Design a protein around this ligand. Structure first.
Ligand SMILES: [Cl-]
Ligand code: NA
Ligand code: NA
Ligand code: NA
Length: 1286
């Protein structure tokens, strides 16, 4: 890949007419106003001027107040001098270097460079490329050494200016055109335009980690400043959307103004939420995302027609067909037969999603190791200045602030304001303006920042479209139910794309049109909002907790008013803490007093409870009530009682309407009498019905995010501020009392007093963990119970009505369908409508282990005899009555028999999608199938039956998806696209059933899928099968993943499945190897089948190094030896194997009874080994001075019974080698605990006996534990129903 060039320059560098020009900006078109401009890279210009278009000079002065939004820094003198301009320029170069220095950043820039605006728009002649517009070109003025000045023009993508009036609020806008006295944006209907950014690198926003999950290193909270490179990248994402003509301007989230506690902001564009990414993207309901997608599809279709029937350009020196090739590439159009450009919907979906959803602030932060806010509604604090971005000791172009050599990389410490105090300065107070609200009590007025208020979305933010009638026919198109795109996929795509060399930018001067700059929308206010309240609010309660700045003895009071009035009194709600801190001189009991404070704080702050009536909330912190003045009438002393009788809704200031209007039943308008069209219409209908459940669930979730979750988030913040106040006050009291303390031990105790203050903070941090859990669980619980309950109510009724409509249509068309088809329809439809769609509460590069963990989107585990998804995505798992449990790899596994009740169904969570849009994916699981008898191979060898399937369940057919199937001794992987085309791996198992993978042994399956190459089947980490899958279309699989024997004609067939798991990428051999090994442990020893090894269980012994041999006994008291096992061969069926269950049976017993009551044999357990013979157990050991080949290989004896002769029989069952084999080693000790060696064999001849491999113990093996093949490795084989000798 060709590196992206970033140009270098000083502001004072002479114009060169290449990288440094005199530009006439778009909104100065034809006015002859020029500014020095600098080409940072292809298609991107920097103009180090304040963005003044549409403003007046007073706009640049700090106002007294703001109308709305977060705090704003004004500075009219910013970016005025040449040295300022140079500093700006040098900073922007550095930021562009930072961005390109990471492949994710490189991908973003590459995408922006090549997304050239279309040479025309909706109001062009539609047959001719038009460069004569300020939407696509800017004029420049070029001076010759001779003295001639020519005015020409350049096409560009992006012009970046310095900031407007507000430094700390960056903006991106497209060029507007005035047509028919109306504002038209080509960047909004497919074409794109020049995009203009106003940007400031040095005045950055701040945020905190208050509501974030805990880490394993830190539990305390901090404020962070943002990295300007990420701020820039966030703006570039908006630019990208504009270039693709996909700027949103329709469905905004409008803040309610109903109440005084509600946050004032400009409406939030849907596009801002998409740019930010993560869970907040779901604030836009799926029906709206669909409306936006449909709009852009239409826009792109219209652009395909325009580009096809283009004839010429206003500029004759442009190459129309060369521009026609960038555009084909840009819009991912295909060519017709006639050479017309057409939309391929598959390609559109990939392109659209990648642009709207692909790059996000959250994703980019992770790639760059830059800390971002976790929530779009997370707390913003005052902005700060970064004065020294150009100093590599503070900020460099590979690591930003988070520099590894300063130990600032770990946990974004370089952005942490507690730590990196060198990197930032507080802004000048005279430049900082806020939206303040005064609260006056009837003459104390407190000032609340707009930031401290709660965002509540107004009802008109939310769609009602899912409630409206929906018409189903055969022509009915399936809508996408997921609109997302991984940055991971973009990067992969990028690395697989070749360079695109743009044509010349230069064009003819812009002469047409008027340079209408939209008027600045001033946030200046000359008033502050002021309210009188009767009763104390949350804000009085918080403010009452604030300590004075001036050093004095502080006391605590349980009275808010008392604290509001007195500057030395702090409101508290920890009565024991209060009692203790209010105490006077302790004299010599001072240290114990400080200890006592810490103890009381610990007990009081750690209070937690549960209420049965709120059964899915694990942690209730009772003191929230008195801390924030959350009180219910009649329960003034009883918050827990209040919560018990109200539910979590008690915690909400704004109580939303949660009941929902009726959902119109689906309707059918289909006249066709063709059977194929009727069935299609039914299939369409069933899908549409599913889509309704999803749409409504998503709408409710959107409303919850914008009206409910915001409040619970605020409660978290409020409680954090309260606890912070409490800790601060206590610290000040301890500090004050320590100061005036006189005692002989003052100096000596200084450390402990400091440790105790630290412990205070720790306990407060732990309380905050509880509070965060409380609010998260209360929020989820309100969504999942109260809100989604109402949805279900209406959806159940929708289902009933919709079922009637469908049954009507089938009855009316019954003569065209047929009685056999009609019976299937009936039972199918009854099944479908007798099961609701569940609601999922999804969660949504260190090393390989991390990569395996992060790319897992489903993971079935069994706990407490229950199968569930442990991935975090929270897919619902339904276990049917005859799904059975057996021993697994780690705990228990799933056992499926050939009946209808033997079934496990996974309903994938709402937001997971691992194999659409041609996404790469891997599926893995442990599998155990019985050795198929010769008889069943004859009867059923050609009967292909699935065991796992995602394949879409239509009314009368099975559609797109994947399946695992078996057919005799073949394991089959099938991919099916939405056209019915398939790709398959057929793995033919080994004929030697002792070594075979489908013969009663736990084996690890891994199937990777690379949509641009092939599907690969691995067993035990080894590649076994491959199929090219290139050319296969889109996979649109069922929501359900079904584990079940499907179409199996053998009533006795069964399978076991463990650790079923899906990854959202194609794993590479190293990853699979690591995945495979990660399941293998030495702790529990294994039998031959892969099950845990057990005491008091009969096992046949087989040596690994000689697996065709059985162990035999010469006689009681005597030695053991190897002989060939009887064998089975079947040429017809191409199967053979050494027969099992012949030869000596052994039993393992604990050497001495211990405090374990399970019967699992663990590695390192002391054992006695016995032979079961003549319905007796005979101990295996070595007699003292017994025969031993060359005095080293001790010959083992069975039931040796010679009086006065010590018999050594203490063994250790151990896993010392070969983790991938289900084999065991046995170590024998003498009575002085000296090793007599590992149990193996030695070739020899005793007396008249034939030459034999004789069982021994020998220390020789201990020098060979890394060898590939060792005679000390033993299989333990118990009789098993899965293996019967033929
Ligand atoms: Cl002997
Ligand atoms: Na600057
Ligand atoms: Na995303
Ligand atoms: Na006070």
């Amino acid at each position: 890949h060709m590196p992206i060039t970033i140009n270098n320059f000083r502001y004072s560098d002479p114009v060169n007419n290449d990288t440094i020009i005199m530009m006439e900006p778009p909104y100065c078109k034809g006015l002859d106003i020029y500014y020095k401009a600098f080409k940072i890279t292809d298609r991107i210009w920097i103009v180090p001027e304040r963005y003044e278009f549409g403003t007046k000079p007073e706009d640049f002065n700090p106002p007294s107040s703001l109308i709305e939004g977060a705090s704003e820094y004004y500075d009219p003198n910013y970016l005025r001098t040449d040295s300022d301009k140079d500093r700006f320029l040098q900073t922007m170069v550095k930021l562009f270097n930072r961005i390109k220095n990471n492949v994710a950043g490189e991908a973003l820039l590459d995408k922006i460079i090549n997304a050239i605006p279309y040479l025309g728009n909706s109001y062009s002649l539609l047959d001719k490329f038009d460069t004569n517009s300020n939407s696509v070109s800017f004029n420049l003025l070029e001076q010759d050494p001779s003295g001639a000045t020519t005015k020409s023009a350049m096409l560009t993508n992006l012009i970046i200016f310095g900031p407007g009036p507000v430094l700390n609020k960056n903006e991106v806008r497209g060029i507007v055109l005035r047509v028919d006295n109306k504002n038209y944006f080509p960047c909004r209907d497919g074409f794109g335009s020049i995009m203009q950014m106003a940007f400031c690198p040095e005045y950055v926003p701040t945020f905190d980690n208050v509501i974030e999950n805990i880490t394993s290193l830190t539990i305390g909270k901090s404020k962070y400043f943002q990295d300007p490179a990420l701020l820039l990248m966030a703006q570039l994402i908006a630019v990208l959307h504009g270039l693709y003509g996909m700027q949103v301007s329709s469905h905004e989230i409008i803040p309610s103004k109903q109440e005084i506690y509600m946050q004032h902001t400009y409406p939030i564009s849907a596009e801002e939420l998409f740019t930010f990414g993560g869970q907040d993207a779901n604030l836009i309901s799926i029906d709206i995302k669909n409306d936006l997608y449909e709009k852009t599809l239409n826009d792109y279709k219209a652009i395909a027609n325009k580009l096809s029937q283009v004839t010429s350009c206003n500029d004759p020196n442009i190459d129309i067909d060369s521009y026609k090739q960038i555009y084909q590439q840009k819009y991912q159009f295909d060519k017709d037969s006639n050479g017309q450009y057409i939309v391929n919907e598959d390609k559109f979906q990939i392109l659209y999603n990648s642009i709207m959803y692909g790059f996000t602030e959250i994703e980019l932060g992770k790639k760059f190791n830059i800390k971002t806010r976790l929530s779009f509604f997370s707390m913003n604090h005052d902005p700060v200045k970064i004065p020294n971005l150009l100093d590599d000791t503070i900020y460099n172009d590979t690591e930003g602030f988070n520099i590894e050599s300063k130990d600032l990389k770990s946990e974004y410490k370089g952005q942490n304001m507690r730590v990196n105090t060198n990197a930032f300065r507080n802004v000048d107070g005279s430049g900082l303006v806020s939206k303040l609200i005064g609260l006056c009590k009837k003459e104390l007025c407190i000032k609340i920042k707009n930031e401290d208020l709660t965002f509540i979305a107004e009802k008109n933010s939310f769609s009602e479209e899912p409630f409206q009638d929906e018409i189903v026919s055969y022509n009915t198109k399936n809508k996408p139910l997921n609109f997302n795109y991984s940055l991971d996929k973009i990067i992969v795509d990028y690395n697989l794309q070749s360079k695109i060399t743009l044509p010349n930018d230069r064009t003819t001067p812009v002469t047409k049109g008027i340079p209408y700059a939209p008027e600045y929308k001033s946030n200046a206010a000359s008033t502050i909002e002021i309210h009188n309240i009767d009763d104390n609010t949350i804000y009085q309660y918080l403010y009452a907790q604030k300590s004075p700045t001036t050093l004095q003895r502080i006391t605590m009071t349980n009275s808010v008013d008392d604290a509001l009035i007195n500057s030395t009194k702090i409101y508290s709600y920890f009565p024991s803490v209060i009692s203790k801190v209010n105490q006077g001189a302790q004299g010599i009991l001072f240290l114990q007093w400080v200890r006592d404070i810490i103890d009381d704080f610990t007990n009081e702050s750690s209070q937690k409870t549960t209420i049965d009536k709120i059964s899915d909330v694990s942690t209730i912190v009772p003191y929230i009530g008195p801390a924030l003045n959350i009180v219910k009438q009649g329960y003034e002393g009883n918050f827990i009682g209040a919560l018990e009788t109200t539910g979590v809704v008690l915690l909400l200031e704004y109580i939303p309407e949660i009941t929902l209007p009726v959902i119109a039943a689906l309707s059918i308008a289909e006249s066709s009498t063709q059977k194929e069209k009727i069935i299609k219409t039914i299939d369409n209908f069933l899908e549409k019905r599913y889509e309704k459940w999803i749409e409504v669930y998503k709408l409710v979730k959107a409303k919850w995010l914008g009206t409910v979750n915001t409040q619970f988030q605020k409660r978290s913040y409020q409680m954090y501020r309260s606890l912070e106040y409490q800790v601060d006050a206590i610290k000040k009291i301890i500090d004050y009392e320590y100061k005036i303390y006189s005692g002989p031990d003052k100096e000596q105790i200084a450390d402990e007093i400091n440790n105790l203050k630290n412990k205070l903070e720790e306990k407060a941090n732990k309380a905050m963990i509880n509070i965060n859990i409380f609010m998260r669980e209360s929020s989820r619980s309100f969504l999942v119970n109260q809100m989604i309950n109402e949805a279900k109510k209406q959806l159940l009724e929708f289902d009933t009505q919709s079922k009637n409509i469908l049954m009507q249509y089938i009855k009316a068309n019954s003569k065209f369908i047929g009685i056999t088809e009609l019976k299937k329809l009936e039972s199918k439809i009854n099944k479908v409508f007798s099961t609701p769609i569940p609601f999922s509460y999804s969660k949504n590069e260190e090393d390989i282990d991390v990569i395996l963990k992060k790319s897992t989107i489903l993971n079935l585990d069994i706990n407490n005899d229950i199968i569930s998804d442990i991935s975090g995505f929270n897919s619902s798992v339904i276990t049917y009555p005859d799904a059975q449990l057996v021993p697994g790899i780690n705990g228990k596994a799933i056992h499926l028999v050939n009946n209808e009740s033997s079934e496990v169904i996974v309903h994938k969570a709402m937001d997971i999608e691992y194999n659409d849009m041609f996404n790469n994916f891997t599926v893995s699981f442990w599998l155990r199938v019985p050795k198929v008898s010769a008889s069943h191979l004859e009867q059923y060898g050609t009967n292909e039956y699935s065991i796992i399937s995602s394949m879409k369940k239509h009314s009368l057919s099975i559609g797109s998806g994947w399946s695992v199937s078996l057919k005799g001794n073949n394991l089959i992987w099938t991919l099916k696209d939405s056209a019915g085309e398939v790709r398959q791996i057929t793995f033919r198992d080994l004929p030697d059933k002792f070594n075979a993978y489908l013969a009663n042994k736990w084996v690890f399956i891994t199937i990777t899928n690379d949509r641009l190459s092939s599907a690969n089947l691995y067993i035990n980490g080894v590649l076994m099968g491959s199929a090219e899958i290139t050319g296969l279309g889109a996979i649109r699989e069922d929501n359900n993943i079904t584990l079940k024997l499907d179409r199996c004609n053998n009533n006795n067939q069964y399978v076991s499945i463990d650790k079923f798991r899906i990854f959202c990428k194609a794993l590479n051999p190293k990853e699979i190897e690591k995945l495979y090994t990660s399941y293998l442990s030495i702790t529990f020893l294994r039998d031959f089948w892969g099950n845990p090894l057990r005491y008091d269980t009969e096992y046949y012994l087989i040596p690994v190094a000689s697996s065709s041999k059985d162990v035999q006994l010469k006689n009681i008291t005597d030695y053991m030896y190897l002989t060939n096992a009887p064998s089975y061969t079947n040429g017809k069926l191409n199967i053979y194997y050494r027969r099992l269950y012949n030869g000596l049976k052994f039993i393992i017993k604990r050497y001495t009874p211990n405090n374990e009551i399970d019967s699992f044999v663990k590695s390192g357990d002391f054992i006695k080994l016995y032979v079961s013979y003549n319905n007796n157990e005979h101990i295996v050991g070595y007699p003292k001075d017994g025969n031993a080949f060359n005095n080293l290989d001790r010959i083992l004896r069975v039931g040796y019974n010679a009086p006065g002769i010590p018999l050594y029989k203490k063994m250790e069952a151990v896993k010392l080698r070969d983790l991938k084999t289900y084999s065991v080693q046995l170590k024998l000790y003498d009575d002085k605990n000296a090793s007599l060696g590992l149990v193996g064999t030695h070739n020899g001849q005793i007396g008249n006996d034939p030459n034999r491999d004789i069982l021994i113990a020998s220390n020789w093996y201990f020098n060979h534990l890394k060898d590939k093949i060792l005679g000390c490795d033993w299989y333990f084989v118990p009789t098993d129903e899965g293996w019967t000798n033929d």
